Symmetry: C6
Subunit: 77 residues, 6 copies
């Protein structure tokens, strides 16, 4: 159904998992994903939410393991 990005982003948003965003320029932002579309992610931190462009993000690391139902390495996609 959903791809890898939508599954990952919807999962960490529905579970409100604390995250760490590693921007390509080395800046690190923390918070939770409250909303995302095709080009950006809305990061909520305390009461302040900031828009982060996907094109500026390198990695998104959850603070705790998150259930993504990743495909098994025994069969194809």
């Amino acid at each position: 159904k959903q791809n890898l990005q939508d599954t990952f982003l919807n999962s960490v948003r529905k579970s409100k998992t604390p995250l760490t965003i590693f921007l390509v320029n080395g800046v690190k932002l923390q918070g939770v994903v409250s909303w995302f579309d095709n080009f950006c992610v809305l990061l909520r931190r305390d009461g302040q939410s900031q828009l982060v462009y996907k094109h500026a993000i390198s990695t998104i690391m959850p603070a705790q393991p998150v259930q993504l139902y990743e495909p098994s390495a025994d069969a194809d996609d």
Copy 2:
């Protein structure tokens, strides 16, 4: 409507002061006065410059908004 349009229209309609963080580590301050698919018009101290969305990494409003 999506998140980016809602966010940008909100911070525009509300004259919200914000901080544009660029991918090169440069910070910009001002108010978004106009935006399209690829850029935004940031006004500060009466001077408005064209900022390209691929140069923007984050947009942080000084006062939060909602939707």
Copy 3:
């Protein structure tokens, strides 16, 4: 016209002296004489220079431009 087209066509038709700030911090000065989907022709006096917009951070006019 959209924001980008209105801004670029106005500083072009008006020959507004500009300062293009690149993503690598390099500053370019001149006047836009032509632009398309990806590039911008920056000419300062007798010299031409094709500037790719993906390398542009911000464009700041030397004088405030009335865009309407």
Copy 4:
């Protein structure tokens, strides 16, 4: 294609990889999932979404076997 064959191969084989990013930092782990824009790198109990647009190279620790046209 090449990218899909390579990524599927190192995924199904769970090959230990080293992902070099454009900003120079090095990532170690196994690719468990990938789409058109991102790659899911698993190391220990950690899962890290990595965007393809920020990757420079992907090199496997052990040699990979691919069938080319």
Copy 5:
């Protein structure tokens, strides 16, 4: 007819104008454009030809003034 990029590249190719291609990472390439497509430019320097990707190009500087037939500032393009 042609847009700015196609006019610029075809002109410096047809006239074999010596160029200085500035990359985003600060390094400067010199030579003559012998061929180009939507994403790449083949720069020739002596008898060496190297593929230059447009996504790494910041500016392109011709060594001499080049005729481009730019639009007049008095009318709309």
Copy 6:
């Protein structure tokens, strides 16, 4: 056909050694054994490496 396809197929068919310059300054050497729309497969000394075109600045062949 297109320049990039012609250039890449040429150095692949002839197995010409080349130097891949990345946008972060790193230099890679090897032979292109396979490529698609977004990546190339650079092989050197039996080790194959998936290189993303969007990270490449220039490709200079040795010959």
